C-alpha cells in the first residue's frame, strides 16, 4: 500500500498541578528577630507568681 495522505501529529498539552511553595514562612520571619518583644514580656512578668 502507498498513501496519498500527509501525516500530522498533535498531542494535547498534559495537565500540570502547581503545589504551594514558600521560600520563608511568616513564622520564620517572626523568628528572624533576635528578641520577640512579646515573648520576653510574657516570660518576665511571671517572676512574682513563679
Amino acid at each position: 500500500t502507498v498513501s496519498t495522505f500527509i501525516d500530522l501529529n498533535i498531542t494535547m498539552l498534559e495537565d500540570h498541578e502547581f503545589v504551594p511553595l514558600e521560600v520563608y514562612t511568616r513564622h520564620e520571619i517572626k523568628d528572624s528577630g533576635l528578641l520577640d518583644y512579646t515573648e520576653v514580656q510574657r516570660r518576665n512578668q511571671l517572676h512574682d507568681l513563679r
Partner: protein, 99 residues
C-alpha cells in the same frame, strides 16, 4: 532569694554575643573558650569572669540525679548573674545556609 533558672539563648551572625529568654545580652561569643583557638573568639569581659570546666558533671536540681556524660562547661559571671552553657565547636554547630 537564691534563684536557679533554665533559659533559652539566641545569637545572630557573627555570633560574637547572644541574648537570653529574659532579654539579657551576654557580650561574649557562645563558642569562646580555651580549646583550639577559642581564645580567638570575642569576649568584652575580663578574662577572670569566664571559667571553662573540662569533664564537668551536671546534677539535676529537681531530679537530684547525676546523669549523662562529661560535658565541658562554660561559666560567665556578669555584674548581675552567672550563666552556664555547654561549650560546643563553632563550625559543626551553625551554618550560613538552610536546606
Amino acid at each position: 532569694n537564691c534563684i536557679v533558672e533554665e533559659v533559652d539563648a539566641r545569637s545572630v551572625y557573627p555570633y560574637d554575643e547572644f541574648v537570653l529568654a529574659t532579654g539579657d545580652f551576654v557580650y561574649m561569643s557562645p563558642f569562646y573558650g580555651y580549646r583550639e583557638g577559642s581564645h580567638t573568639e570575642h569576649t568584652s569581659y575580663a578574662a577572670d569572669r569566664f571559667k571553662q570546666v573540662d569533664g564537668f558533671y551536671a546534677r539535676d536540681l529537681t531530679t537530684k540525679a547525676r546523669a549523662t556524660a562529661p560535658t565541658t562547661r562554660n561559666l560567665l559571671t556578669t555584674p548581675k548573674f552567672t550563666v552556664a552553657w555547654d561549650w560546643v565547636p563553632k563550625r559543626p554547630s551553625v551554618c550560613t545556609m538552610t536546606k
